[PDB]
């Protein structure tokens, strides 16, 4: 389609994701979309066979094919695709890295987390424990795993990575940290 942007490409959502395997996290393309004249989609890598596809609605075009003046993704309101790329995209790749790195998340399948939960819970049976883990049914989003004690249930609470921070319940915290006191304080009441 017609659109002149050094990571566009008229790629479909399997030719996007063949194109990024190879790649770094935080590598995307924008492309076009089979939702009509007025959508594309930047495509991403979040990790090795884990994309999300992001949908980009256009508004106020000028023919069908040109890109829109104005441009929403996740609700909100952008002039064009490089801000998207900048304060929309790049934030997503700050917060899932500042995520991955971080001592509580957990890498791989959720069956092999639970697995690791559960034998850690076992061995501190009066601490209460929980980790973070990727979600690779649900692209963006983690699983939040916690056991009260060896003898408590492991409870799942799902959380959504934004612009501006990880979602949960019905808060956006803007770090890492604040997301895990929120959650400490979620549960005491």
């Known amino acids: 389609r017609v659109i002149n942007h050094p990571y566009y490409f008229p790629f479909n959502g399997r030719q996007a994701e063949d194109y990024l395997r190879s790649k770094e996290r935080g ?32 508004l106020e075009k000028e023919n069908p094919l040109a890109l829109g003046k104005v441009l929403i993704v996740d609700n909100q309101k952008y002039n064009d695709l490089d801000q998207i790329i900048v304060e929309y995209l790049q934030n997503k790749v700050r917060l899932l890295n500042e995520m991955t790195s971080s001592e509580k998340f957990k890498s ?6 639970v697995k690791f939960i559960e034998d850690y819970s076992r061995v501190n049976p009066n601490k209460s424990v929980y980790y973070f883990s990727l979600n690779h049914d ?24 934004t612009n501006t921070g990880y979602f949960l319940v019905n808060y956006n915290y803007p770090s890492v940290i604040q997301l895990c006191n929120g959650f400490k304080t979620l549960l005491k009441s």
């Open 108 to 113: 791989g399948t959720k069956k092999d987390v």
């Open 138 to 161: 649900n692209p963006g989003w983690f699983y939040l795993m916690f056991k009260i004690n060896a003898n408590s249930k492991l409870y799942t609470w799902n959380v959504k990575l």
């Open 27 to 58: 590598e995307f393309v924008i492309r076009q979309s089979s939702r009509g004249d007025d959508h594309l989609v930047i495509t991403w890598k979040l990790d090795k066979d884990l994309f999300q596809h992001i949908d980009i609605q256009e």
